[PDB]
Amino acid sequence: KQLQKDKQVYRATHRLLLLGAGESGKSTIVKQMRILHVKATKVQDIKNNLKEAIETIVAAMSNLVPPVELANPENQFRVDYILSVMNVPDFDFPPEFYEHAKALWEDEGVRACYERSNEYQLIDCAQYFLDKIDVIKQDDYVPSDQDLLRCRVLTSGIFETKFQVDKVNFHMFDVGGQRDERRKWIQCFNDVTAIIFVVASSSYNMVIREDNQTNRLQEALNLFKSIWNNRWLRTISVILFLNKQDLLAEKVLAGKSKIEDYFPEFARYTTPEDATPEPGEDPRVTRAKYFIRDEFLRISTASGDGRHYCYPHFTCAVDTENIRRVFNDCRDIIQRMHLRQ
Amino acid sequence: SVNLEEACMERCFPQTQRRFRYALFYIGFACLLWSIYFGVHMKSKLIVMVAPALCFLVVCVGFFLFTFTKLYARHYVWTSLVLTLLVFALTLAAQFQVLTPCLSQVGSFSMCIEVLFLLYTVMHLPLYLSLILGVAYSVLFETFGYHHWELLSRALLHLCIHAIGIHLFIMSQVRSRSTFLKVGQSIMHGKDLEVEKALKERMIHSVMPRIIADDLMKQGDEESENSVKIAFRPFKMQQIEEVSILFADIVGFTKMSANKSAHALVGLLNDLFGRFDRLCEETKCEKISTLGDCYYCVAGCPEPRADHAYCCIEMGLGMIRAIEQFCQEKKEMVNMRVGVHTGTVLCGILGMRRFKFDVWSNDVNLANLMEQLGVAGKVHISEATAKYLDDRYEMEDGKVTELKTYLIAGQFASATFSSLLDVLLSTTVFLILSITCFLRYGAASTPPPPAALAVFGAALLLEILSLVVSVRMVFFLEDVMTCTKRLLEWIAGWLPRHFIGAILVSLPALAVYSHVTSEFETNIHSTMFTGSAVLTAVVQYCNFCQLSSWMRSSLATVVGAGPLLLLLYVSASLIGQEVILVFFLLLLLVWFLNREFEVSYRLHYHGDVEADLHRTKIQSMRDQADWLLRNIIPYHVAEQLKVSQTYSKNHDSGGVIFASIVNFSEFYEENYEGGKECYRVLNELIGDFDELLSKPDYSSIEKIKTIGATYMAASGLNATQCRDGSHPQEHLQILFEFAKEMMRVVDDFNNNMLWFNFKLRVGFNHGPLTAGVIGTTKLLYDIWGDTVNIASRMDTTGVECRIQVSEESYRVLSKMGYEFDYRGTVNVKGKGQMKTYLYPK
Numbered sequence A: 001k002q003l004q005k006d007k008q009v010y011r012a013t014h015r016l017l018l019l020g021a022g023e024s025g026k027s028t029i030v031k032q033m034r035i036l037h038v039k040a041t042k043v044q045d046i047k048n049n050l051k052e053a054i055e056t057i058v059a060a061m062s063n064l065v066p067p068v069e070l071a072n073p074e075n076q077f078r079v080d081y082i083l084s085v086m087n088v089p090d091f092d093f094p095p096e097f098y099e100h101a102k103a104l105w106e107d108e109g110v111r112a113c114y115e116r117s118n119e120y121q122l123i124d125c126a127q128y129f130l131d132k133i134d135v136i137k138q139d140d141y142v143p144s145d146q147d148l149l150r151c152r153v154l155t156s157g158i159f160e161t162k163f164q165v166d167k168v169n170f171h172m173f174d175v176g177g178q179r180d181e182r183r184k185w186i187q188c189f190n191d192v193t194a195i196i197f198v199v200a201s202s203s204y205n206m207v208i209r210e211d212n213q214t215n216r217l218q219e220a221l222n223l224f225k226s227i228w229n230n231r232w233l234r235t236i237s238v239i240l241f242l243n244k245q246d247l248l249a250e251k252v253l254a255g256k257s258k259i260e261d262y263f264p265e266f267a268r269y270t271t272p273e274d275a276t277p278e279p280g281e282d283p284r285v286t287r288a289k290y291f292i293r294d295e296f297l298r299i300s301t302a303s304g305d306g307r308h309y310c311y312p313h314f315t316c317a318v319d320t321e322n323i324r325r326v327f328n329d330c331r332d333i334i335q336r337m338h339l340r341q
Numbered sequence B: 001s002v003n004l005e006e007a008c009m010e011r012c013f014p015q016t017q018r019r020f021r022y023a024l025f026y027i028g029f030a031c032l033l034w035s036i037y038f039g040v041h042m043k044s045k046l047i048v049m050v051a052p053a054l055c056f057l058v059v060c061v062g063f064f065l066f067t068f069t070k071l072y073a074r075h076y077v078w079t080s081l082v083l084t085l086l087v088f089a090l091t092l093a094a095q096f097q098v099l100t101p102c103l104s105q106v107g108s109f110s111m112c113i114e115v116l117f118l119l120y121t122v123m124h125l126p127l128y129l130s131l132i133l134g135v136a137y138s139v140l141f142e143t144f145g146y147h148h149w150e151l152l153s154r155a156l157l158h159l160c161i162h163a164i165g166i167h168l169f170i171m172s173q174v175r176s177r178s179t180f181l182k183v184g185q186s187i188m189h190g191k192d193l194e195v196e197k198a199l200k201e202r203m204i205h206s207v208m209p210r211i212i213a214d215d216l217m218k219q220g221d222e223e224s225e226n227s228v229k230i231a232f233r234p235f236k237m238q239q240i241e242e243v244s245i246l247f248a249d250i251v252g253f254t255k256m257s258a259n260k261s262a263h264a265l266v267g268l269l270n271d272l273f274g275r276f277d278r279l280c281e282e283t284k285c286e287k288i289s290t291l292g293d294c295y296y297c298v299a300g301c302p303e304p305r306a307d308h309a310y311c312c313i314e315m316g317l318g319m320i321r322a323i324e325q326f327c328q329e330k331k332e333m334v335n336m337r338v339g340v341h342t343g344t345v346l347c348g349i350l351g352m353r354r355f356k357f358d359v360w361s362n363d364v365n366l367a368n369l370m371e372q373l374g375v376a377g378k379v380h381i382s383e384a385t386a387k388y389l390d391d392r393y394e395m396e397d398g399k400v401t402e403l404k405t406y407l408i409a410g411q412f413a414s415a416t417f418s419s420l421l422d423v424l425l426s427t428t429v430f431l432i433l434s435i436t437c438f439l440r441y442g443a444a445s446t447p448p449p450p451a452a453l454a455v456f457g458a459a460l461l462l463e464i465l466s467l468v469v470s471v472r473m474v475f476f477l478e479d480v481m482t483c484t485k486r487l488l489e490w491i492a493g494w495l496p497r498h499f500i501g502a503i504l505v506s507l508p509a510l511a512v513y514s515h516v517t518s519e520f521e522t523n524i525h526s527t528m529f530t531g532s533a534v535l536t537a538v539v540q541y542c543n544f545c546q547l548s549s550w551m552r553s554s555l556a557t558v559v560g561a562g563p564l565l566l567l568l569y570v571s572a573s574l575i576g577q578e579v580i581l582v583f584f585l586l587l588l589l590v591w592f593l594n595r596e597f598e599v600s601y602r603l604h605y606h607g608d609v610e611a612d613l614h615r616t617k618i619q620s621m622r623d624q625a626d627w628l629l630r631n632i633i634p635y636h637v638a639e640q641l642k643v644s645q646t647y648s649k650n651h652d653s654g655g656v657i658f659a660s661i662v663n664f665s666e667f668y669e670e671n672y673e674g675g676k677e678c679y680r681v682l683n684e685l686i687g688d689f690d691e692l693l694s695k696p697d698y699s700s701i702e703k704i705k706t707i708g709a710t711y712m713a714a715s716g717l718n719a720t721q722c723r724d725g726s727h728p729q730e731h732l733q734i735l736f737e738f739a740k741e742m743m744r745v746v747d748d749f750n751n752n753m754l755w756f757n758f759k760l761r762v763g764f765n766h767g768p769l770t771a772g773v774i775g776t777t778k779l780l781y782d783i784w785g786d787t788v789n790i791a792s793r794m795d796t797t798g799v800e801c802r803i804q805v806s807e808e809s810y811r812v813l814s815k816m817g818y819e820f821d822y823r824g825t826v827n828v829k830g831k832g833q834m835k836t837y838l839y840p841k
C-alpha cells in the first residue's frame, strides 16, 4: 500500500507560507536559510542593481522639483554617458564605466540624493553597492555571503525549499508581493502550517511602484486587514516579523523623517511600559518600534476569537543570531500549532 | 401470531427436547435416590417400593430411545402427559400406607413439591392443562393426607406454590416469545441491508468510474464518511498525462429535430446513443457526458493504454459506422464531426450537487476547436496525434479554410416491568407467608417473642419501600419530584442489583425464623409444621431470574442450608437422611434450575442487542443510498422512473437561465503542480452556489448540471400540483430575484478575494421545453428545446455584470413590477433578429 506512511510523513513536515509586502526581504530570509541549514548570475544581477541604481539616481536628479543639480557639473560627459546607456538591456562593464559611476560617486548630489532617494522609487541597499563597485572593478575574489544577502532580485512565482533542521522538516514558499501577483496568493492557502509576515520598517515615507501615491506602511496595514478577517485564514496563527531594523535606526539618527507628521497617531502617543529593551537605546527608537508593534497589534485586537493568534517578534536581515533565536522560537511555536488539533 | 409462533417451537423443538431429556435425567436421579433410601437405610420389611421406580427407569432410558423417533411431532407434549400421569400414579399410589403408629408432612409434601415444579418448569404443558392438573393433584393429594387448624395452612402452602408456579410459567414462555421475535427481525433486516447495499452499489456505479468508487467502497479516509452527512472542502482531482480526447457532434442540428413528439427524438437520438454505448463498451472507452447535440469520450485516464490513440481513432471510425449504418438505417440527411487530441488532462469532480466526473485541460479545448475546425467523414487529428501514430492510415492535410493538423479516413415483558411482578408478587406471597406463620395459632392468639414482630416490622417496611419506590419509578406520575429517583438509582448500578436482590431474597427466611429461638416440640406438630414451613418458603429465591447462578444459587444454599442441618443437631430420632436428602435434591434442583433461567435471560439480552445494531446499519444505508437518488436525478422523474424503465415528458412553459464566469481563463495560470489550487477556489465557489439552493422557498428551483465554468438551472417543473396558491409566473419572478441574489453572492465572493474581481453574465428565457432521460446504466437527466437555445445564444453574447432579458420576458416582468431598458435587436441564429432588453439601468 504505502499510502499511510507517506501520508503520515506528509503530516509530519513543516510547510511555511511567507507572505508579505513588496520587496521586503522574504527572499533574503530564504537565502539566510540556505546559508544556515544547507553560480555565475551573481555578477550579472548585482551589476544590474548597480546600473539600474546609478541611472535611476542620475536620471532622477532633474526629476526632483526641489532643484537637485550636480555639485560637480564638470562630469557632464559622464552624465550624458549615463543618459546614453539609460535604456539598454546589454552592457559589458568596462573599467571606464567604473570611472563613470566612480566619479559620479565622488559628487555630493549623489550623496544627498542618497539621503533623499526615498522621495521616489530607488533601491535601499546601494550604500553597500557603490563602495563594493569602488572595490570590485575586477571580481577575481569571489564575492562573499553578505554579498549574497545584498543581491536584489525581483521575486515572483512560487519557489520552494526543503531543508532539514535537527529532525525537523522544512518545505517553504517564497511568494511575490507585487499587486498583480496577488492573484497567486490563494495558491498557497491550502492548509499550510504557519504564516509569517514581513514589513519593511522604514517604509513610512515611501510608496509602492504601482501608484506612487500612497504609503507602503498603510499598504501593509490594508494587507494585514485583508488577510486578518478572511473566511480562509482563521485557523493559522501568524508570526509577525518587522524587518529592516537598522535602516529605521539610521533614519532615527537622521531625525529628518517623522511618522507623526504623516500619521498623527504617533503625535500624542506615549511609550509602552511593558517593554523589553536593547543595550544603549534611544527612547525614540523604542517608541517607534513599539508604536508600529502596537499599530499591527491594534489590528490584531479586532478579531481572532481565540482561533488565529498574533505573535509579534522582531528581526533584521543582517543578524545570524537573530534568525537563530527567534526562528528557534518559531520552531517551538509551530511545534505547538503543528500539534494543536 | 398463530402459524409463525407455531413454527418457532417447531424449531425450538430440539432445545426443549434437550432440557427435557435432562429432566428425564433428573427423573432417573429421583428413582436413584428412592433406590438408595430404600436400599441401605431402613424399610427392609417390604420391597414394594422399588419396582415402580425401576419401570420408571426403563421409562427414562426407554423414552430416551423414544426421543429420537418420528411418530413424535404431535406426540411429545402428550408424551410429557403420559410421563406425569405415571408420576401421579406413582406418588398417589405410594402415599397412603400410613397412620399406623410415621411419615410426616415433610415426606409427602416434599414429594408434592418436586412433582409440581418438575411439572411447571420443563414438561411444557399448556396453561389450562397443567393448571387444573396441578390443582386437582393438590386437593386430592391433601385429602390423601387426611385419611381446620393446620390443614388451612396446608392449603395456603398449596395455593401459594401454585401462584409462584404460574408466575414462573408465564415469564418462561413470554421470554420464549420475545427471543424468537427479536431473532426473526434480526434475520430479516440483515438480508434487506445486503440487497439495498447492492442498490446503492448500482447508484455509485451509474455516475462514475471504478477507482474513486472503490475509494468510497471501504472507508479508507473517514473524511468521506464525514462528507456524507470549514477551511476547504474535499474533492478528488488528479493531473494525468498522455491521454487522448474524442469529440463528436452533428452538423446542422438546427431544423433537423423540428417535428419530433419528444419521444421520436428520444427514439433515434437514444437509439444512436444506445449504439454509442455498445461501441464504447466494446471498444474499451471512457464516455463522459452529452452536451446537447455533442457526445464525447476520452482514452484511458484511469488506465493509460499502450496503443490508446489507435483505440480512439478506430473507435471514431466506429462512430463513422454509427452514422453510416444508423443514418442509412433511418434514411436521413445528417453528419457528424470528430476531433481528437493527445495531451495531458487534470480530471476529477467539482461541486457537491448533481456532480459528475469531468475533465479539464486546454488540450480539451484544442479538441473543441478541432471540432470547430472540423469537416465531415474523416477524423480531425492534431500534430501531437500524428507525431507517434505508427503512420498505418490515410494521412491528409487538415488545412485552414482561411495549427499543423492532419486528417485520417481509414486503412410487554420488559425487565424492570417484570421486576415489578417478581417483587410485588414476592411480597404478596410473603404477606401470606408471614400471615400463615402467625395464624396457625388458632389454639393460641399471639406469637411469644416481640422480636418476631420486629422482623415483621422492618421486613414489611423494607418490602413496602422497595414496592413504592419501584412502582412510582415505573408508572410515570411526575407530580411532586423525580430527582430522588435519579439520585437514588444513581447509586443503584449493576452490583446493587445483586445486593438489594439479596436483601429482599434473604429476609423472608428470617421471617419464618420468627418462630425459631425458644421451644418448638412440646407439640411436635409445631416442629414438623415449621420444618415444612421453611422448606416451603425456601423455594422463593428463583424469582430474581436476572442475577447470576453461582451467586444466587450459592447464597440460596447458605440461607436455605444453615439452621436446618445445624438445628437438627441440638437436642427427633431418625429423620435426617430423608429430610436433608430431599434438601439435597432441593438444592441441586434450585442450582440447576435458576442457572438455566439466568442463562436464558442473558441470551435474550444478547438477541436484542445485535438486532438493534443491524437496524441502525440499515438506517444509515437507506439515508446514504436514497441521498444519492436525491442527488443524481430529479424528484417526480424519480416518481415516473422509480417503478418503470422509460421517460419522456412534454413541457409548455418554463424558465431557464445561464450564468457565465467571464475571467476564469485569465486567472487560470498553471505554473504550479497542475494549478489545481485554482480548481479548489472554483470548487469553493460552485459549492457556495450549491448552498444557495438549500432554502425552502428556493427549493423550488432545479439545477440542471455544470458545464465547465457555465452554470445552469431551471424551474417550472416542481409545480406538479394544481394548487390554489401558486401563481402561474411566480417561479419566474423569484428566479429573477435569485439571479440578483447570486449576483450579490459573487460580489461577496470577491469581497473575500483580494485585489481581484470575477465578472459574470446571466441570461433568461421562458418557453416550452423537453424533459428527458438518456443513459443506460450510465445516465443523465436532461432538457431540450428551442428555448434553451435562445437563452444559450443570449448569454453567450451577453455583456457582463448584467441581466439579459428576452422581449417576451420583457413583456411579462414589467407587469410583475420590474424596470428595464431597451438595448437593441441582436442577431439570433434561427430567429434572424431578436429584440433585446436589459435589467440594470
Ligand SMILES: CNc1ccccc1C(=O)O[C@H]1[C@@H](O)[C@H](n2cnc3c(=O)[nH]c(N)nc32)O[C@@H]1COP(=O)(O)OP(=O)(O)OP(=O)(O)O
Residues within 6 Å of the ligand: B249, B250, B251, B252, B253, B254, B257, B258, B291, B292, B293, B294, B784, B785, B786, B787, B788, B789, B792
Ligand atoms: C428546436 N430546438 C431543439 C429541440 C430539440 C433538441 C435540441 C434543440 C436545440 O435547440 O439544439 C441546439 C442546442 O440547444 C443544442 N444544444 C447543443 N449543445 C448544447 C449544450 O451544451 N447545452 C444545452 N442546454 N443545449 C445544447 O444543439 C443545438 C445547437 O448546437 P450548437 O449551437 O452548440 O452548434 P452545434 O452543436 O454544432 O449544432 P449545429 O451548429 O450543427 O446546428
Ligand SMILES: Nc1nc2c(ncn2[C@@H]2O[C@H](COP(=O)(O)OP(=O)(O)OP(O)(O)=S)[C@@H](O)[C@H]2O)c(=O)[nH]1
Residues within 6 Å of the ligand: A020, A021, A022, A023, A024, A025, A026, A027, A028, A029, A124, A125, A149, A150, A151, A152, A153, A154, A155, A156, A175, A176, A177, A178, A243, A244, A245, A247, A316, A317, A318
Ligand atoms: N539593509 C537591509 N537590507 C535588507 C534587509 N532586508 C532585505 N534587504 C534588502 O532588500 C532587498 C529586497 O529584498 P527581497 O528579499 O528581494 O524582498 P522580497 O520580499 O523577498 O521580494 P518580493 O517577494 O516582495 S518581490 C534585498 O536585496 C535585500 O538585500 C534588511 O533588513 N536590511
Ligand SMILES: C=C[C@@]1(C)CC(=O)[C@]2(O)[C@@]3(C)[C@@H](O)CCC(C)(C)[C@@H]3[C@H](O)[C@H](OC(C)=O)[C@@]2(C)O1
Residues within 6 Å of the ligand: B359, B360, B361, B362, B364, B365, B368, B664, B665, B707, B708, B709, B710
Ligand atoms: C472552464 C474552464 C476552461 C478553461 C476549461 C476547459 O477546458 C473548458 O471547460 C472546456 C473545453 C471543457 O470543460 C469541456 C467542456 C466545455 C464546456 C466545452 C469547456 C469550454 O469550452 C470552456 O470554455 C468556455 C466557453 O467556457 C473551457 C475552455 O474552459
Ligand SMILES: [Mg+2]
Residues within 6 Å of the ligand: A023, A024, A025, A026, A027, A154, A155, A156, A174, A175, A176, A177
Ligand atoms: Mg521576494
Ligand SMILES: [Mn+2]
Residues within 6 Å of the ligand: B249, B250, B251, B252, B253, B293
Ligand atoms: Mn453540430
Ligand SMILES: [Mn+2]
Residues within 6 Å of the ligand: B249, B291, B292, B293, B294
Ligand atoms: Mn454543441
